[PDB]
Design a protein around this ligand. Structure first.
Ligand SMILES: O=C([C@H]1Cc2cc(Cl)cc(-c3ccnc4cc([C@@](O)(CO)CCl)sc34)c2O1)N1CCNCC1
Ligand SMILES: [Zn+2]
Length: 335
């Protein structure tokens, strides 16, 4: 309900309602979503326009906001379509559509501005002079949590140098089968940091994946300078916790909640589909360790004013407002 919390819920679609709120309260994205030139797009088919509708209605409605038009636009209507994919794949499906629509426009490069970081995957031979680098972009990170107490330990394990010895030695081609060091190194961390946590793993004796219900800790403030190669004293890599996406119950079904800190000000709310309610820091952060938190969103402190900048009704263009109201006037009177 809007009167208690300030915010409205979504109506049921497993992990989408959790992600849509998370992307909506990324205010700099929301503004750019409104500036997409969707006037010459079809209503039923356009994913850009459907996300504009949800964002419009989440900003403006007092009642809960529908997602049926958005599901129909990218074809994930049934339950089995949601089950096959993960949250990062859904996030990639939404944000790629938004990025491609924003190309050749005033708000181009907004997705990579907010979400795209850079890393180097490297292989160094120990006893011969051969190094092999690849610069990769990333929009999300998938962190390991099995045998890891916290995020710091998971980032250590992410960047940990694997040795290649004995059986598994590096094929250097001309130099031959060589002993070597494999690792990954973060070059930059983006303003909005989507961190998924590896709650599933492969168990050999059952021929099937199984859930990890272990206690995993994550802080409100997250320093990550030690995980970057070349730090910046003018811009430290200190990250404020923004959202926590949570699962409960069994796998084939269950319940899907997101906790959120929409202004970056420690004032937490639980978004349980249609019922949005206030909650403590401890219900959002501490109590969702081990029920399992599966994705976390961190915003960079230096970029927090820009990322969570104030949206107004003036930031939605007139043609889009006129379009979405003309739908709602026709959609009401139909009986
Ligand atoms: O079992 C489920 C249900 C029950 C359940 C429990 C838990 Cl604790 C998390 C998820 C979940 C939902 C969305 N995205 C993700 C991503 C995950 C990763 O671990 C692997 O990509 C991140 Cl590294 S877990 C997860 C979940 O979904 N499935 C079958 C497989 N796809 C989703 C639906
Ligand atoms: Zn993402």
């Amino acid at each position: 309900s809007k009167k208690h919390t300030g915010y409205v819920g979504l109506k049921n679609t497993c992990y989408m309602n959790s992600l849509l709120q998370t992307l909506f309260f990324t205010n700099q994205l929301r503004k750019a979503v409104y500036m997409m030139p969707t006037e010459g797009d079809d209503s039923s088919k356009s994913v850009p326009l459907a996300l504009q509708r949800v964002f419009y209605e989440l900003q403006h409605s007092d009642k809960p906001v529908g997602t049926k038009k958005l599901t129909k636009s990218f074809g994930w209507e049934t339950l089995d379509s949601f089950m096959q994919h993960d949250v990062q794949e859904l996030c990639r499906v939404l944000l790629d559509n938004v990025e491609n629509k924003m190309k050749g426009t005033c708000v181009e490069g907004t997705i990579p501005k907010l979400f795209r970081g850079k890393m180097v995957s490297y292989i160094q031979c120990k006893e011969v002079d051969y190094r092999s680098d690849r610069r990769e972009d990333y929009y999300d990170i998938q962190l390991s949590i099995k045998g890891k107490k916290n995020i710091f330990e998971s980032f250590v394990d992410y960047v940990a140098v694997e040795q290649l010895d004995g059986d598994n030695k590096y094929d250097a081609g001309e130099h031959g089968l060589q002993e070597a060091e494999k690792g990954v190194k973060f070059l930059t961390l983006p303003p909005v940091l989507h961190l998924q946590l590896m709650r599933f793993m492969y168990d050999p004796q059952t021929d099937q994946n199984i859930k990890i219900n272990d206690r995993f800790e994550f802080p409100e403030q997250l320093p990550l300078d030690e995980f970057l190669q070349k730090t910046d004293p003018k811009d430290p890599a200190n990250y404020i916790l923004h959202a926590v996406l949570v699962h409960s119950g069994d796998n084939h079904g269950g319940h899907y909640v997101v906790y959120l800190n929409p202004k970056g000000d420690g004032k937490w709310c639980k978004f349980d589909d249609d019922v949005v309610s206030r909650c403590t820091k401890e219900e959002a952060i501490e109590h969702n360790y081990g029920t399992n938190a599966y994705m976390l969103v961190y915003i960079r402190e230096s970029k927090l004013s820009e990322v969570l900048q104030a949206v107004t009704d003036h930031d939605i263009p007139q043609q889009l407002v006129e379009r979405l109201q003309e739908e709602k006037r026709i959609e009401a009177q139909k009986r």
